[PDB]
């Protein structure tokens, strides 16, 4: 591990310094269906006409990115995504830009979102939930080692693959930071107290969100929920959490450590770091190596009927792709 990582940082650093650019054209892909929608761009199932392969293309309208002040966050996402490599992170195949939009072509992950499955099913069993949590633990350990903070962990950002494993997507708030950071971003339900409290934070926000995930997976609903964000923020800083009566004893305490308001007592930010998590009673059966190798028995395999099948994804209205005669935000996005 410390060994594995050391080598991993070396590769990430190479890519960090020399990020790839315009590795494709819009015209090489056949637009097929929208798999998801964004606040300034959507995601489409697309087909590379030369290779016959399908991918998921993320399109971002340059002007909307500017109106929403997400330029640097958009630059972070691409730079970071093209440099990373782990079994549980989506692969950025290509990226290019044109007069109107920015494009990120990634590997298509046929299984759908963890969200849809969780919602439909209700709640996952601790064993099923732990299978997932363990993969997020290894991803964070990998991510933080490269000085990155993910910042948007939620069922909506985790995709299931043919093999029943996890694929983390959406690095829109990912940042390589040595030291503290101050942007208020993420999803309300998963916001750590420090963030909502505007005090400046580090990786520990990623360990809080994990606690919120495991809980949402095992209970079927978030530990803090209301109808309007302010009410949510209220519960989060309150430092009070109630556990469903079916949570195991080991789960109740793993969670009490991750959902530690005091980030100087919070698992993942202590002296032992991630080991305090990997070595917790709840994970006693977990064979970390076996998981990293994908040799464990996945409890659930979503089934897709052939390539390009999009049944595990919701139907969206198809807004048409428009591209201006004129370049739109050339200077802002020159490094993209």
């Amino acid at each position: 591990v410390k060994e594995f990582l050391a080598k991993a940082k070396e590769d990430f650093l190479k890519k960090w310094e020399n990020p790839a650019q315009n590795t494709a054209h819009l015209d090489q892909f056949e637009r097929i269906k929208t798999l998801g929608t964004g606040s300034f761009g959507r995601v489409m199932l697309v087909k590379h006409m030369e290779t016959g392969n399908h991918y998921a293309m993320k399109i971002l309208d340059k002007q909307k990115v500017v109106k929403l002040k997400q330029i640097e966050h958009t630059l972070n996402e691409k730079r970071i995504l093209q440099a990373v490599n782990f079994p549980f992170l989506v692969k950025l195949e290509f990226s290019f830009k044109d007069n109107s939009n920015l494009y990120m072509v990634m590997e298509y992950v046929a299984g759908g979102e963890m969200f849809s499955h969780l919602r439909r099913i209700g709640r996952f069993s601790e064993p099923h939930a732990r299978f997932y949590a363990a993969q997020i633990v290894l991803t964070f350990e990998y991510l933080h080692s490269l000085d990155l903070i993910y910042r948007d962990l939620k069922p909506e950002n985790l995709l299931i693959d043919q093999q029943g494993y996890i694929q983390v997507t959406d690095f829109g708030f990912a940042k390589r930071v040595k030291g503290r950071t101050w942007t208020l971003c993420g999803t309300p339900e998963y916001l750590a107290p420090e963030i909502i409290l505007s005090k400046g934070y580090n990786k520990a926000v990623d360990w809080w969100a994990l606690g919120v995930l495991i809980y949402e997976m095992a209970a079927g609903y978030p530990p803090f929920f209301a109808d309007q964000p302010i009410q949510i923020y209220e519960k989060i800083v309150s430092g009070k959490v109630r556990f469903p009566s079916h949570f195991s004893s080991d789960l109740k305490d793993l969670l009490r450590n991750l959902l530690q308001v005091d980030l100087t007592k919070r698992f993942g930010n202590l002296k032992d770091g991630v080991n305090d998590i990997k070595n917790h009673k709840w994970f006693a059966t977990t064979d970390w190596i076996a998981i990293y190798q994908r040799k464990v028995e996945a409890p659930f395999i979503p089934k897709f009927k052939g390539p390009g099948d999009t049944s595990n994804f919701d139907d969206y209205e198809e807004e048409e792709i428009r591209v201006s005669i004129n370049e739109k935000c050339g200077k802002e996005f020159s490094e993209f």
């Binding site: 606040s39 929403l68 002040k69 919602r119 208020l184 999803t187 978030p222």
Partner: peptide
């Protein structure tokens, strides 16, 4: 039940992230 409460709530669908 908390579950029932969550289901009748306004945030059961896909949650968007907060920018500004």
């Amino acid at each position: 039940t908390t579950y029932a409460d969550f289901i009748a709530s306004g945030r059961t669908g896909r949650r968007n992230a907060i920018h500004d």
